[PDB]
Design a protein around this ligand. Structure first.
Ligand SMILES: CCOC(=O)[C@@H](C)O
Ligand SMILES: [Ca+2]
Ligand SMILES: [Ca+2]
Ligand SMILES: [Ca+2]
Ligand code: NA
Ligand code: NA
Length: 261
């Protein structure tokens, strides 16, 4: 048995629902007590166990409320998740990366015992929107010990992520005019070296701001990716390989992966 497996056996329906099988509580990390970032809200399962821990960054102009739905959603599938605020809302991607790292360290030793007792410190991941997705790529590049990375409509000036060894799912938006997939997501995905496990999922019809409102496709595939890689849960492989149907009527415009993993 996998010592990391949590929760009931998955179904597509369960993954698309507004809330997973775990009840979520919240702990507020204030700006002034949080070293190296602007504070945040830690969402965690009420059910006592150890879980993987995830930090999620907003983008330029955004705050924790811009990604809170997704932090809660993910925690409700059995994860400890911090949705951060940055030191300033104008912070650039690589500052965002440092702040994501500080938020992981915060959960591990500065949060309450309720939070720390629910984390397996060895199983960590990072996510983020837009410049926060650029920050996710950078942290993934600098921390190969991470179990997963999920950049959402990522923006970064650096196009080549040739040193990422962390399993990375990049979620792009078809009609993004701020971080165009042509200039941002795709080059990033193409550059992640073999044999790193990876996937690219482009949301049909979507704008740059699709990650800031509840989105069943982002919720389903973010959880499936974290389950597979943070929890070594092979019950989730079914959703990722061969992956979503694409094509004219799909919510997924395009899907690439290195399946089987
Ligand atoms: C809500 C965050 O908005 C962004 O990150 C845009 C400006 O990239
Ligand atoms: Ca709740
Ligand atoms: Ca602070
Ligand atoms: Ca389309
Ligand atoms: Na685009
Ligand atoms: Na992008």
């Amino acid at each position: 048995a996998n010592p990391y497996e949590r929760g009931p056996n998955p179904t597509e329906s369960m993954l698309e629902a507004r809330s997973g099988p775990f009840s979520v509580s919240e702990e507020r990390a204030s700006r002034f007590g949080a070293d190296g970032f602007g504070g945040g809200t830690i969402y965690y399962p009420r059910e006592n166990n150890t879980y993987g821990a995830i930090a999620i960054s907003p983008g330029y102009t955004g705050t924790q409320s811009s990604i809170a739905w997704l932090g809660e959603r993910i925690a409700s599938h059995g994860f400890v998740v911090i949705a951060i605020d940055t030191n300033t809302t104008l912070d650039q991607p690589d500052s965002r990366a440092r702040q994501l790292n500080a938020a992981l360290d915060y959960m591990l030793t500065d949060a309450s015992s309720a939070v720390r007792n629910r984390i397996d410190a060895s199983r960590l991941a990072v996510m983020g929107h837009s410049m926060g997705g650029g920050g996710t790529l950078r942290l993934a590049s600098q921390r190969p010990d991470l179990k997963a990375a999920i950049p959402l409509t990522p923006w970064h000036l650096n196009k080549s992520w040739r040193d990422i060894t962390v399993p990375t799912l990049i979620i792009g938006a078809e009609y993004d005019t701020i971080a165009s997939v042509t200039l941002h997501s795709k080059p990033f995905y193409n550059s992640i070296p073999s044999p790193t496990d990876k996937a690219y999922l482009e949301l049909d019809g979507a704008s740059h701001f699709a990650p800031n409102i509840t989105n069943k496709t982002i919720g389903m595939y973010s959880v499936a990716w974290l389950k597979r890689f943070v929890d070594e849960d092979t019950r989730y492989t079914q959703f990722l390989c061969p992956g979503p149907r694409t094509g004219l009527l799909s919510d997924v415009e395009e899907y690439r992966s290195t399946c089987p993993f």
